[PDB]
């Protein structure tokens, strides 16, 4: 409705807005998937989000930590094969970035914005897990039930664990897309 209600209901988006790529800030964010309404499985997650790009992933843990990632590419691309016919694990571009809102508040861009293959590992997903940020650790990792997950330092984003404990339980997961071509 009005400005106050819109801001109140979507505070985390308005806090994040200035971190998005500048061209994206001119589009309208739309809720693609929420564990509060749409099921709670990678299978229903893919069906709803996989042809959108870019997307914004927001995790609220049962420990009241809030973090997530801007994802450059459609999750549909998780199954792309190279020219040998071997499925590619990691996909995406260097516009992908991690963020945390609570307890800390930080943006971890790709370390190559200013190297090796292992610092260019953005997104990966299959029937057992979805992960973001790879290379000697996984920045965000979540299981097929979107119930439990882990977080670690990774070399693509040189981040710390986005919550103090290395693990978390998901209270709610939200995915936003962008419309307005």
What angle (nearest 5°) sits at the alpha carbon of residue 71, between those of residues 92 and 80? 35
Nearest to 90 by CA among 79, 101, 100, 105: 79
Q: What is the rounded distance in angstroms from the CA atom of residue 181 to the CA atom of residue 179?
A: 6
Q: What is the rounded distance in angstroms from the CA atom of residue 68 to the CA atom of residue 130?
A: 12
3-class secondary structure, 12: helix
Which residues have a Cβ under 8 Å from the Cβ of 7 and sit 6 or more positions away?
Answer: 14
With tokens 């670690």, the residue in question is 152
Experimental technique, in short, is X-ray
Which residues have a Cβ under 8 Å from the Cβ of 167 and sit 6 or more positions away?
Answer: 148, 149, 150, 151
What angle (nearest 5°) sits at the alpha carbon of residue 165, between those of residues 160 and 166? 65
Q: What letter does residue 158 receive in the DSSP assignment? A: T
Q: What is the rounded distance in angstroms from the CA atom of residue 104 to the CA atom of residue 116?
A: 29
Contact 77, 109 (CB under 8 A): no
What is the DSSP secondary-structure string of 97-135? Answer: EEEEEESS-EEE--TT----GGG---EEE-SSEEEE--S
Residues forming a β-bridge with 61? 170
Q: What is the rounded distance in angstroms from the CA atom of residue 55 to the CA atom of residue 46?
A: 12
Measured over the CA atoms of residue 161, residue 68, residue 146 and residue 49, the dihedral's sign is negative
Nearest to 119 by CA among 108, 107, 130, 106: 108
**What are the backbone angles phi and psi of residue 111, rounded to the nearest 5°?**
-70, -15
Q: H or E stretch including 48?
A: helix 42-49
Q: What is the rounded distance in angstroms from the CA atom of residue 123 to the CA atom of residue 140?
A: 10
C-beta atoms surrounding 39 within 10 Å: 14
């Amino acid at each position: 409705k009005n400005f106050i209600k819109t801001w109140t209901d979507r505070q985390f988006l308005f806090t994040l807005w200035s971190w998005l790529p500048v061209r994206i800030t001119m589009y309208q964010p739309v809720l693609l998937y929420t564990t509060e309404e749409h099921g709670c499985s990678l299978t229903t997650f893919y069906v709803r989000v996989e042809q959108h790009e870019p997307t914004l992933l927001m995790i609220k843990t049962c420990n009241n930590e809030v973090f997530g990632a801007y994802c450059s590419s459609r999750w549909f691309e998780r199954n792309v094969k190279d020219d040998k016919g071997q499925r590619q694990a990691y996909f995406g571009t260097g516009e992908t970035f991690l963020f945390s809102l609570y307890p800390e508040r930080a943006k971890y861009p790709w370390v190559g914005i200013e190297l090796g293959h292992s610092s260019e590992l953005f997104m990966a997903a299959d029937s057992k897990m979805i992960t973001i940020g790879g290379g000697e650790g996984q920045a965000i990792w979540m299981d097929e039930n979107i119930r439990f997950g882990k977080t670690d330092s990774c070399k693509t984003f040189n981040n710390p664990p986005l919550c103090p404990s290395g693990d978390f339980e998901i209270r709610v997961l939200e995915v936003y897309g962008f419309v307005g071509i």
